[PDB]
Amino acid sequence: AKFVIRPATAADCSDILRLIKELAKYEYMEEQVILTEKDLLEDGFGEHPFYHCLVAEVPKEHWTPEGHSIVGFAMYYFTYDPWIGKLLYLEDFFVMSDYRGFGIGSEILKNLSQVAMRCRCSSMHFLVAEWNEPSINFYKRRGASDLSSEEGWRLFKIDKEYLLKMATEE
């Protein structure tokens, strides 16, 4: 269960999509993943990357039965709030079950925190499902607070089909 945490490089895109799907098919949303390798590659390693990713890599002897060395990841990016400051936004955080409990998640969180201090971020933001009490307590044990409930904020979206109408108006 030896492993190291490191930034993902262009060569890692197949693995990231693999872990996204593995994450999805851990929540049975696997088919919902429209994202392709070309997208991960053009969106993360071009001139202006739209996301950043730290991955967990295991040695040859610990490869997955499928034969893969990356067994976990965290996807994130920086955002900004005029009344909070510059923020590190944690989008996805996942470690394959047969590799959990060996400190991988802990190391990722420590390095994301260090990256936050480097970037002079005032806070780390992320989403948690209201019913997922185990995940909620994990984060509260780390000092997190439910901003949506304490301050009365709801997350909204306007999907592509509506943005298209409005954009092509008249």
Ligand X SMILES: CC(C)(COP(=O)(O)OP(=O)(O)OC[C@H]1O[C@@H](n2cnc3c(N)ncnc32)[C@H](O)[C@@H]1OP(=O)(O)O)[C@H](O)C(=O)NCCC(=O)NCCS
In the complex, the smallest distance separating the C-beta of residue 46 from ligand X, rounded to whole angstroms, is 25
Cα 125 to chain centroid distance, Å, stands at 11
Q: Which residue is nearest to ligand X (CB)?
A: 105
Strands across the sheet containing 52-57: 4-7, 52-57, 70-81, 85-95
Q: 64 by DSSP, 3-state: which?
A: coil
C-beta closer to ligand X: residue 42 or 52? 52
Residue 67 near which of ligand X, a copy of itself, none (CB within 5-8 Å, type-dependent): none
x/- letters, 94..133, toward a copy of itself (CB under 8 A): ------------xx-xx--xx-xx---xxxxxxxxxxx--
CA distance 3 to 41: 24
User: How far is residue 93's CA from residue 76's CA, in Å, rounded to a whole number?
Assistant: 9
Question: In Å, how far from its chain's centre is CA 28?
Answer: 17
Q: Of 28, 77, 139, 162, which residue is the catalytic one?
A: 139
Nearest to residue 16, comparing CAs of 61, 74, 60, 65?
74
Question: Which one of ligand X, a copy of itself, none is in contact with 101 (Cβ closer than 5 to 8 A by kind)?
Answer: ligand X
Query: Catalytic residue at 76?
Result: no
- Touching ligand X, residues 53-112 (CB under 6 A): 93-95, 100-106
Inter-residue contact 58 to 2 (CB < 8 Å)? yes
The residues that touch ligand X, with contacts defined as CB under 6 A, are 23, 26, 93-95, 100-106, 126-128, 132, 134-135, 137-138, 141
- Known binding residues are 26-27, 91, 93-95, 101-106, 125-127, 132-135, 139-142, 151
